[PDB]
Design a protein around this ligand. Structure first.
Ligand SMILES: CC(C)[C@](C)(O)C#N
Ligand SMILES: CC(C)[C@](C)(O)C#N
Lengths: 256, 256
């Protein structure tokens, strides 16, 4: 079967991270939409203009709003993209056939929205050469960050070639986890986000979202299905593109 | 010998086009700077804020200005980048060891700055699915454009793989040739731009900067050296990356 996949990049990244996976999925006959979230990729906004993870998710929400009645999509989020999925699901659950998490945070409905992010910071506290700054938006102090090049090289693009790593150094932008904003955000709902089918994809060779963290997430909020990809790194859509496409095809053949 | 190469992308593109060549040059021991020109790549400005090719060249001029006395660089410009080179050379000729043109326009000093662009439009009048728009800046009506995806696929990235082509569809932005502005711009000088060493690199398999045009440019303004790369396409830094690096190494060993 064919599906319409909506690929969602992580913070400090953009649609470009999916440049290898998108054409492969299309070669299988699928429709693919790779969005640039707010102040990401070539989006015209700067991070200082964004005050929450919800605002950051605007392009995704706007896209879903534009889907004609009856049309459903399979959301695929990497790393922090799981949060955009949760936000989107609480507004357009009926338009989501399923959500695939790609070495991604997996929010739940029993704890605050920042719950898994707080846990992530405990498991991976040292972001190496990453730099930080603060800005104010809507009366709140937000911590912005720019991923360090060493962190990118050693923990995120561990096995990616020099040409993919180069794209990251050239294209990654300042962003934010909006951690303190998520902490005060209303909980994700059981009726919306809680109702969608969730497929968790990961590799135990991820050098940032460590096994301890991902296995902790799986136990915390049981996914409907779990796929473990052998080898690769945090950026499976670059290092195990074929494997990811195969998994997504099976998801398309399972949920609609 | 080692040199400091400053790679200059063409309109509607960004530093990202050099993601394959940059690491290869560094692997040879060179220092490489790949800039995003105004309203290009991840630059925060939008094209409607730019009123001339000179303004568009701001990041390059600012970079050269920051070079300490005595430090020289080898400029490498692709496609329309030759115009940024001419503009830069008339302000910082002493900081330029040489300029390499990569399937690029080659301005001269005998005719108006838009001369070769006007000729290009005669040789390649049909830009296929490219779209156009107009905006006003500093009292002048400027024609903006967004490269069509079919034009990108068939004429610019003719032999590039689907993954490189995908990056182009995701990252190319609205831009402008500022043709009418160039037409009224003071001529490039013989003392500045005219004095720099110019190396012309091209392939007769370029599907947009056709042989008729490139050979016309070579006859119009004699380069100091000409390198013809066999095969490849308009984006030699992607399809003949190794060959381009070899040529640049020889240039580094020839001019300083
Ligand atoms: C490093 C991690 C938090 C990110 C930016 O989401 C990725 N990849
Ligand atoms: C199509 C051509 C004018 C451009 C944008 O410079 C390239 N490549």
């Amino acid at each position: 079967a064919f599906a319409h996949f909506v690929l969602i990049h992580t913070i400090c990244h953009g649609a470009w991270i999916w440049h290898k996976l998108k054409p492969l999925l299309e070669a299988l006959g699928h429709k693919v939409t790779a969005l640039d979230l707010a102040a990401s990729g070539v989006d015209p906004r700067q991070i200082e203009e964004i005050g929450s993870f919800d605002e950051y998710s605007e392009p995704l929400l706007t896209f879903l709003e534009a889907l004609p009645p009856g049309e459903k999509v399979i959301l695929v989020g990497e790393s922090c993209g799981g949060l955009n999925i949760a936000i989107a699901a609480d507004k357009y659950c009926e338009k989501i056939a399923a959500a695939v998490f790609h070495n991604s945070v997996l929010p739940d409905t029993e704890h605050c929205p920042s719950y898994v992010v707080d846990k992530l910071m405990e498991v991976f506290p040292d972001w190496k050469d990453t730099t930080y700054f603060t800005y104010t938006k809507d009366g709140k102090e937000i911590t912005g960050l720019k991923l360090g090049f060493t962190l990118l090289r050693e923990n995120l693009y561990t096995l990616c070639g020099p040409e993919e790593y180069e794209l990251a150094k050239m294209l990654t932008r300042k962003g934010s986890l909006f951690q303190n904003i998520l902490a005060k955000r209303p909980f994700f709902t059981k009726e919306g986000y809680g109702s969608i089918k969730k497929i968790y994809v990961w590799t135990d060779q991820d050098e940032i979202f460590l096994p301890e963290f991902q296995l902790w997430q799986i136990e915390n909020y049981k996914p409907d299905k779990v796929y473990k990809v052998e080898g690769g790194d945090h950026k499976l859509q670059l290092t195990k593109t074929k494997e990811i496409a195969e998994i997504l095809q099976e998801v398309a053949d399972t949920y609609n």
